[PDB]
Amino acid sequence: PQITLWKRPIVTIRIGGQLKEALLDTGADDTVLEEMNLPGKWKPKMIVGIGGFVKVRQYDQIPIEICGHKAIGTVLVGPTPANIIGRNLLTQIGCTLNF
Amino acid sequence: PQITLWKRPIVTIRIGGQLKEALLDTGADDTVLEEMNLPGKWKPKMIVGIGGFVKVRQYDQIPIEICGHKAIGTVLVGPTPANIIGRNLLTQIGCTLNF
Numbered sequence: 001p002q003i004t005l006w007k008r009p010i011v012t013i014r015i016g017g018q019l020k021e022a023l024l025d026t027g028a029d030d031t032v033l034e035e036m037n038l039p040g041k042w043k044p045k046m047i048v049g050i051g052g053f054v055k056v057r058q059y060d061q062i063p064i065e066i067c068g069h070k071a072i073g074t075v076l077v078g079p080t081p082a083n084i085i086g087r088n089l090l091t092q093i094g095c096t097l098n099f
Numbered sequence: 100p101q102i103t104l105w106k107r108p109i110v111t112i113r114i115g116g117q118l119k120e121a122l123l124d125t126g127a128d129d130t131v132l133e134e135m136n137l138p139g140k141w142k143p144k145m146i147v148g149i150g151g152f153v154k155v156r157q158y159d160q161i162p163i164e165i166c167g168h169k170a171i172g173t174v175l176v177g178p179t180p181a182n183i184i185g186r187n188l189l190t191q192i193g194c195t196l197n198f
């Protein structure tokens with residue numbers, strides 16, 4: 001699809017058997033989701049945003065479907081005000097900016 | 100141009116007679132720049148990011164050139180760890196997501 005930016009680029013994703021909504025966020029290096037349960041090992045990570053540093057849990061090689069496209073990659077989980085799909089997963093579904 | 104997302108989508112902008120770099124950020128409603136001087140009236144505004152609420156100054160109808168495209172729009176100024184061009188200005192230069 002071609003998504004214009006008059007509205008937030010929110011799409012439906014499926015992960016760990018749940019349907020959630022998330023932001024396609026080219027300003028994010030990494031995908032970060034609101035608190036949820038994921039299986040397997042995780043390591044503590046820190047990220048920075050507007051507001052400062054935030055502590056998160058990193059899970060790797062997590063299957064996720066994004067607006068109909070299936071992907072596998074790293075997912076961070078923590079106290080984000082928004083589910084965001086960052087560049088690490090946007091590249092997996094062939095997402096680009098165009099103008 | 101078509102910009103892939105293996106790297107941060109950083110472009111050169113010109114604003115208040117300065118050249119700066121900024122991130123094309125579909126996950127931002129609003130354009131937010133690191134501390135700088137702009138002419139005219141400004142109102143205090145609050146935004147939220149990953150690390151909480153942040154107080155910023157809002158300036159309206161500011162000319163800005165972004166990767167060669169001229170635009171006019173609202174610019175927020177405050178303690179952001181990055182210059183970010185948000186949807187309010189991405190729409191002005193005809194920027195879309197495609198996958």
Ligand SMILES: CC(C)CN(C[C@@H](O)[C@H](Cc1ccccc1)NC(=O)O[C@H]1CO[C@H]2OCC[C@H]21)S(=O)(=O)c1ccc(N)cc1
Nearest residue numbers: 027028029030048049050081082126127128129148149181
């Ligand atoms: C500031 C950027 C370098 C990075 N941010 C991504 C950014 O797109 C966030 C993404 C975002 C979105 C909503 C809430 C928090 C963070 N947007 C944001 O801070 O924008 C603010 C300015 O305009 C407003 O519109 C939306 C929030 C406001 S970030 O959320 O802090 C971030 C940092 C690292 C990762 N891996 C993921 C996300």
